[PDB]
Design a protein around this ligand. Sequence first.
Ligand SMILES: *[C@@H]1O[C@H](CO)[C@@H](O[C@@H]2O[C@H](CO)[C@@H](O)[C@H](O)[C@H]2NC(C)=O)[C@H](O)[C@H]1NC(C)=O
Ligand SMILES: *[C@@H]1O[C@H](CO)[C@@H](O[C@@H]2O[C@H](CO)[C@@H](O)[C@H](O)[C@H]2NC(C)=O)[C@H](O)[C@H]1NC(C)=O
Ligand SMILES: *[C@@H]1O[C@H](CO)[C@@H](O[C@@H]2O[C@H](CO)[C@@H](O)[C@H](O)[C@H]2NC(C)=O)[C@H](O)[C@H]1NC(C)=O
Ligand SMILES: *[C@@H]1O[C@H](CO)[C@@H](O[C@@H]2O[C@H](CO)[C@@H](O)[C@H](O)[C@H]2NC(C)=O)[C@H](O)[C@H]1NC(C)=O
Ligand SMILES: *[C@@H]1O[C@H](CO)[C@@H](O)[C@H](O)[C@H]1NC(C)=O
Ligand SMILES: *[C@@H]1O[C@H](CO)[C@@H](O)[C@H](O)[C@H]1NC(C)=O
Ligand SMILES: *[C@@H]1O[C@H](CO)[C@@H](O)[C@H](O)[C@H]1NC(C)=O
Ligand SMILES: *[C@@H]1O[C@H](CO)[C@@H](O)[C@H](O)[C@H]1NC(C)=O
Ligand SMILES: *[C@@H]1O[C@H](CO)[C@@H](O)[C@H](O)[C@H]1NC(C)=O
Ligand SMILES: *[C@@H]1O[C@H](CO)[C@@H](O)[C@H](O)[C@H]1NC(C)=O
Ligand SMILES: *[C@@H]1O[C@H](CO)[C@@H](O)[C@H](O)[C@H]1NC(C)=O
Ligand SMILES: *[C@@H]1O[C@H](CO)[C@@H](O)[C@H](O)[C@H]1NC(C)=O
Ligand SMILES: *[C@@H]1O[C@H](CO)[C@@H](O)[C@H](O)[C@H]1NC(C)=O
Ligand SMILES: *[C@@H]1O[C@H](CO)[C@@H](O)[C@H](O)[C@H]1NC(C)=O
Ligand SMILES: *[C@@H]1O[C@H](CO)[C@@H](O)[C@H](O)[C@H]1NC(C)=O
Ligand SMILES: *[C@@H]1O[C@H](CO)[C@@H](O)[C@H](O)[C@H]1NC(C)=O
Ligand SMILES: *[C@@H]1O[C@H](CO)[C@@H](O)[C@H](O)[C@H]1NC(C)=O
Ligand SMILES: *[C@@H]1O[C@H](CO)[C@@H](O)[C@H](O)[C@H]1NC(C)=O
Lengths: 656, 499, 138
Amino acid sequence: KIVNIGAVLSTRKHEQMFREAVNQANKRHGSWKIQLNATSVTHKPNAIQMALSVCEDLISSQVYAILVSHPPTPNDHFTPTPVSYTAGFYRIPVLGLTTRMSIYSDKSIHLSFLRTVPPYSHQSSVWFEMMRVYNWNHIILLVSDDHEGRAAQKRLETLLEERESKAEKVLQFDPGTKNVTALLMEARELEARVIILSASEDDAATVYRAAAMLNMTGSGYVWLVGEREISGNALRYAPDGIIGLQLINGKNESAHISDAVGVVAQAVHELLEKENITDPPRGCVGNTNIWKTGPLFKRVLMSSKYADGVTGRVEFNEDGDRKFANYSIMNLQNRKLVQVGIYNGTHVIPNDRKIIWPGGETEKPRGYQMSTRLKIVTIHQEPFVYVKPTMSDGTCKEEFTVNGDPVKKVICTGPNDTSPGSPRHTVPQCCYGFCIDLLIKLARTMNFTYEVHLVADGKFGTQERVNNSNKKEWNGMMGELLSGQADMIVAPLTINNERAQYIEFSKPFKYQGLTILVKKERITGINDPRLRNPSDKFIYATVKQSSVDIYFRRQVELSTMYRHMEKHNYESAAEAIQAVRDNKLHAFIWDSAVLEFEASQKCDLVTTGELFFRSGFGIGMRKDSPWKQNVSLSILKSHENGFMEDLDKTWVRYQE
Amino acid sequence: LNIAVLLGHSHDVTERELRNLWGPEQATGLPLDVNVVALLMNRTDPKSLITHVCDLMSGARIHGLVFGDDTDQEAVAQMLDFISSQTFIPILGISGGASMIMADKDPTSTFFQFGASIQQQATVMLKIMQDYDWHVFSLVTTIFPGYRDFISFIKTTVDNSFVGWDMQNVITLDTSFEDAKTQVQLKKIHSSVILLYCSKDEAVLILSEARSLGLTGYDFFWIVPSLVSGNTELIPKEFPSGLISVSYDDWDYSLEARVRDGLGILTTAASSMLEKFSYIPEAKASCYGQPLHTLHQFMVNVTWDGKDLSFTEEGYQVHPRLVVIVLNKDREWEKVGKWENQTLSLRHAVWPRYKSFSDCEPDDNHLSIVTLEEAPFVIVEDIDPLTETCVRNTVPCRKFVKINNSTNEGMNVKKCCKGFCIDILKKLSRTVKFTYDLYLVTNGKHGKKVNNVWNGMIGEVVYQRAVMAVGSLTINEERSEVVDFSVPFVETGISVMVS
Amino acid sequence: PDDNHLSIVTLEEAPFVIVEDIDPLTETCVRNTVPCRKFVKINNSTNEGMNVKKCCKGFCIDILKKLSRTVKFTYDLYLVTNGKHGKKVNNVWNGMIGEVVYQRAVMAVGSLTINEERSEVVDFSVPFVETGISVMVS
Ligand SMILES: *[C@@H]1O[C@H](CO)[C@@H](O[C@@H]2O[C@H](CO)[C@@H](O)[C@H](O)[C@H]2NC(C)=O)[C@H](O)[C@H]1NC(C)=O
Ligand SMILES: *[C@@H]1O[C@H](CO)[C@@H](O[C@@H]2O[C@H](CO)[C@@H](O)[C@H](O)[C@H]2NC(C)=O)[C@H](O)[C@H]1NC(C)=O
Ligand SMILES: *[C@@H]1O[C@H](CO)[C@@H](O[C@@H]2O[C@H](CO)[C@@H](O)[C@H](O)[C@H]2NC(C)=O)[C@H](O)[C@H]1NC(C)=O
Ligand SMILES: *[C@@H]1O[C@H](CO)[C@@H](O[C@@H]2O[C@H](CO)[C@@H](O)[C@H](O)[C@H]2NC(C)=O)[C@H](O)[C@H]1NC(C)=O
Ligand SMILES: *[C@@H]1O[C@H](CO)[C@@H](O)[C@H](O)[C@H]1NC(C)=O
Ligand SMILES: *[C@@H]1O[C@H](CO)[C@@H](O)[C@H](O)[C@H]1NC(C)=O
Ligand SMILES: *[C@@H]1O[C@H](CO)[C@@H](O)[C@H](O)[C@H]1NC(C)=O
Ligand SMILES: *[C@@H]1O[C@H](CO)[C@@H](O)[C@H](O)[C@H]1NC(C)=O
Ligand SMILES: *[C@@H]1O[C@H](CO)[C@@H](O)[C@H](O)[C@H]1NC(C)=O
Ligand SMILES: *[C@@H]1O[C@H](CO)[C@@H](O)[C@H](O)[C@H]1NC(C)=O
Ligand SMILES: *[C@@H]1O[C@H](CO)[C@@H](O)[C@H](O)[C@H]1NC(C)=O
Ligand SMILES: *[C@@H]1O[C@H](CO)[C@@H](O)[C@H](O)[C@H]1NC(C)=O
Ligand SMILES: *[C@@H]1O[C@H](CO)[C@@H](O)[C@H](O)[C@H]1NC(C)=O
Ligand SMILES: *[C@@H]1O[C@H](CO)[C@@H](O)[C@H](O)[C@H]1NC(C)=O
Ligand SMILES: *[C@@H]1O[C@H](CO)[C@@H](O)[C@H](O)[C@H]1NC(C)=O
Ligand SMILES: *[C@@H]1O[C@H](CO)[C@@H](O)[C@H](O)[C@H]1NC(C)=O
Ligand SMILES: *[C@@H]1O[C@H](CO)[C@@H](O)[C@H](O)[C@H]1NC(C)=O
Ligand SMILES: *[C@@H]1O[C@H](CO)[C@@H](O)[C@H](O)[C@H]1NC(C)=O
């Protein structure tokens, strides 16, 4: 009765420590006839002969559990891989002791690998625990390493799924490149200042240099990294006040080997309690079959609970990782690594030392430096947003109304419609009218500046499917909203169901419905049954990728018109007005007050009598944001007085 | 180039046809030194595998490696992935354990399999579910590794469709089931289609628990990936007759066609990379005592013999060969669904019950119903190409379309029915609570006794090929003689149209 | 976890919440209506009262029924007894606004206008009908 245990080990002193741990494992574990034998191998510079030596030693040895504890002296990459693959061929368990790569967490590669150390991805758990201490909710994730950092990003999005509060922006790039300053500018432009990095040494030193070039060590900035960033040459160029994580006894090798041998020993003494016990044979002689109680012994190792340990209480999770590991939380007090906190698995306790921040005093960084400037996008709506080219040099002609009130114009930026069809300049331009003056009143109410720009292409924005993999995307003003290019859509935006699922809406400032523009012979709205089956004499359509398209796509009895007007959709409303003025159409489907304004302009343009889809123009907004309550309250304050009536007296009520 | 093709098999297949596999091929021979070496093997232990790989690398500096397998040992492909991570040898697996799916690779690794990823197989399964309009479903997974990416890709794919997949909860497990609290997770399932992601050792117990809890009706459906569908011979009794699986094992493309495609990929990469730089093959000297232009970033633009055998960034195939199989009442696997560049091609647009899981199923609610096109009653239209789905007021149907007169063979092209009688059928299915298989007639018009032979819907109902004709149909004396009618619902006599 | 017994207060108006007696011959509301109760004080001397069960129909009742058939929640509907919609009197709200603020009513399904002070003290849904102010003459 013997049990063979293999060990892949570095030194010669820890070989004696492994033999001493085998001797101590046979001390108090009963007078049973079982014994424990020790087998140790050393390094080779190339990994092929490492796997060759391991298989030639351990096929002849018939071991049960293999301990692998490679310290990376020449290279920090994938040295415990071959022993893991070799024993995972025969499904023999490998206990990794010094490696921490998250590629070992995926058991689709390593079928029979466990480890008594926690990987870097569970550091993200601590980073989630960094959010509950200071009540932080918006973070900026910068992942450098694409090898294992996607697993840490997935773990962070999994742990933030319980709060249902996503990160503000996640960024991924390639290790090795240096010029990553545009990523830093994208991290700059957002209101949050919490920066979370997981990287190797060299890319961390690169982004430390590039952040020192860009004032990112000042006040408000919060830097939160792991173990690989507080060492090497990255520690030489680390910004002061940084918060890092460190493994308590993570390189203490002797006690770690002893605790692993105790784990293996109690697993063996539990394995002898059961029957149907086999041995992994000499696999080099024609043995392609796996060891039959492989998953059984693996299930023993996964559910192996322990209360003994020199480092502490060791326990495996559902993925074979070290649970409830104590961490040190380190601060960099002017190029001095200072321990400022301890991490049990459920809670953080700081010590008597104070957490000196990267900025000025010891006050906590409320990392929401909210912007007084808001990116505003709108479309050229003729009764609402007049867009007109500048007079002399980027300036607007000061035009007066009928009462001598100066028209409050703004310097927006207007690109042309066809960028390859003509030399496209993207010149600034003048914006005024209804919604522009509403925005000027809103900026008059609350102290915030603004930058009005326009949409790249004249579409509101629809749920449009992209060609590869049939994936849904958004375009137009909503496509520029969700891409971060916009912050607040003040525009004639139609409220419906599909938009409010993704973005938020204020209370509507305009109440109107859909109606029909004709040339005057009665039509009498949508309830004319002859338009239900149209022909070449009923030529009518709507704006391409408008809200009318979605509203007619939902209602199934309006499908036939939806299968007609899809052949004649136009890019903008004014093109349809000019087409129906020359009698190239017969009707048009659009909102109420715009067509009433066009009827006030041109007497031949006639709106119909019926009315449907009584909805409201409101302000298109972002997600959870501090511009939800007071914007709606300011619109409602504009509704309770006669200011909306005065804006109607400017353009809506105004006849000609 | 210097290319070795190894076959670790059990069924004895000779090797000189692999030597002839290059001879009449490569009509435009751009490389100047191409020699293939075919080897056979019966033992797949990694010591001997690495030994033979080092012997072949010392064997006149072999630069390309092809490995086939007939067994289920998937770790051999991982050992080949480790070998390619060190010796810088492009290695292509074929079948068996040589092409079973592993998740992520290394940039030093140039090993690439012949198989489809679990994400593309999830796209396959959701395409199958889209083509039958089985919208409401459930997802049941376990703690087998590779489940978080599976559930994540399903959650992204539901959020990237116009279908509106009314999905139930995602049910996982914890341990070997006590049948106490996992049973509570299983009792909440009441929808039809269940996607099951678990290993073959677990799937027998899970389907036995589902059969013991009445989750194996013909209303229900069970679709599994290739994780449980391994050996075609090994079929336990607990598999439900009506199981739909997907695997890339094709009986039309054997191992010889696969190694021919692998040699085509290797010769295409060698002849196309030679046009940029000449001295591309630079093998490692020996395996004892330790590059700019590699084929790791050149494998994307490959096309040999018309086959689009392009590769992905994760190491998979862009257009891989998938096979959609079912489990019939004969307890065997039948090849059903084949594949286009992107979409599915079904051999049977008619999906029958596959009712007999065993003899313990006495129920009956499906009704074979034929109709006929009438312009105010039954409007039959093409399916919407934007969604590949009949719009919600319409119902799916088939039409046995024949392109041309002399050929009797036709295709059951799926179309969408709407109108008045379709609304009547939907409200009857709401009230009486039954199902149906609505289809069209190709014999002709409503009904006429052509020499003691009825045509159209009357010929369907009298000869019992259709259960009832819910579609629009006039009633007169002889029609009331041969079949039976219901109460009338619309005052339809005759009339005369004039100016 | 039982967080769906939603207590809902409503207000008597003619075009929206038609509040009728139950049928005395059948003791059952007709099935196109909903049940409700009203806390009517019988004696004027003290604060005793009874919850008389009555029937409700109309426009907002159909909105409540379609919400109950779409979102699939239970609802416990009752009339307000303190008076009209509500007004801040001595910094004390009353009406449906008071029943939502003092947490006896979860939501106000009945007909209710929107101004700044209500949007301060409670939160409205989206508007479903264009109802401003208006002037009736002959
Ligand atoms: C117990 O382990 C020892 C040490 O690994 C084994 O002794 C080795 O046996 C091999 C047999 O080929 C010899 O080549 C070595 O010289 C021995 N060890 C040394 C000095 O390196 C021993 O065989 C094992 N006994 C068993 C079977 O339990
Ligand atoms: C951490 O490193 C220290 C270095 O001293 C080690 O701890 C001692 O190890 C020796 C040899 O095993 C023991 O006799 C002592 O009991 C340990 N220190 C104490 C508690 O006095 C060890 O390698 C690592 N782990 C520990 C136990 O801290
Ligand atoms: C680490 O472990 C200690 C126990 O040793 C945890 O202390 C418990 O914490 C919870 C929540 O704060 C309390 O309700 C219990 O009363 C505590 N029990 C004891 C015995 O202390 C501690 O929370 C963990 N994390 C740290 C370091 O705070
Ligand atoms: C929205 O407007 C309200 C108006 O009351 C603002 O609330 C006040 O602002 C201060 C700012 O420090 C807050 O402390 C208080 O909640 C309010 N005043 C007091 C003393 O009651 C609110 O800040 C505005 N929110 C934004 C910025 O949109
Ligand atoms: C490369 O380096 C410069 C250095 O300032 C950096 O600003 C920029 O992002 C990169 N390219 C340029 C010159 O735009
Ligand atoms: C950093 O801050 C200063 C503030 O005066 C300003 O010149 C600029 O934003 C940055 N200049 C550098 C690169 O030091
Ligand atoms: C354990 O071994 C006995 C004797 O070889 C065998 O009969 C039995 O099948 C095994 N255990 C199981 C699987 O019940
Ligand atoms: C962490 O440290 C505390 C204090 O020494 C100890 O009680 C606890 O058991 C440790 N946990 C582990 C698993 O190291
Ligand atoms: C945008 O529009 C005009 C007219 O289409 C075009 O000539 C020019 O490229 C742009 N603006 C200027 C500079 O006129
Ligand atoms: C404008 O901002 C300043 C600085 O934060 C603040 O003092 C003031 O109250 C704000 N409001 C006005 C009056 O515009
Ligand atoms: C996808 O196809 C559409 C046409 O349906 C085309 O406009 C678009 O350019 C294609 N690709 C992109 C960039 O989405
Ligand atoms: C396995 O293959 C080798 C090489 O072909 C051969 O020498 C050996 O005899 C085979 N083993 C058996 C038992 O067939
Ligand atoms: C691949 O090469 C061919 C050469 O004709 C050509 O289709 C094109 O240049 C390339 N296409 C891709 C996908 O790079
Ligand atoms: C793939 O598409 C091409 C046309 O681009 C077509 O010729 C070919 O037949 C398609 N392949 C399949 C499998 O249908
Ligand atoms: C039927 O006729 C058309 C036109 O001649 C022809 O293109 C088609 O191939 C024929 N179909 C067959 C062969 O059944
Ligand atoms: C044969 O079928 C074609 C349609 O595919 C049709 O145009 C033609 O009239 C048919 N021939 C006859 C006379 O049956
Ligand atoms: C109200 O009070 C009167 C006596 O004053 C009594 O008769 C009556 O029953 C009371 N109302 C009730 C309790 O219904
Ligand atoms: C108050 O007094 C009157 C007297 O008839 C009677 O209706 C009842 O007692 C009370 N009515 C009210 C207001 O409930």
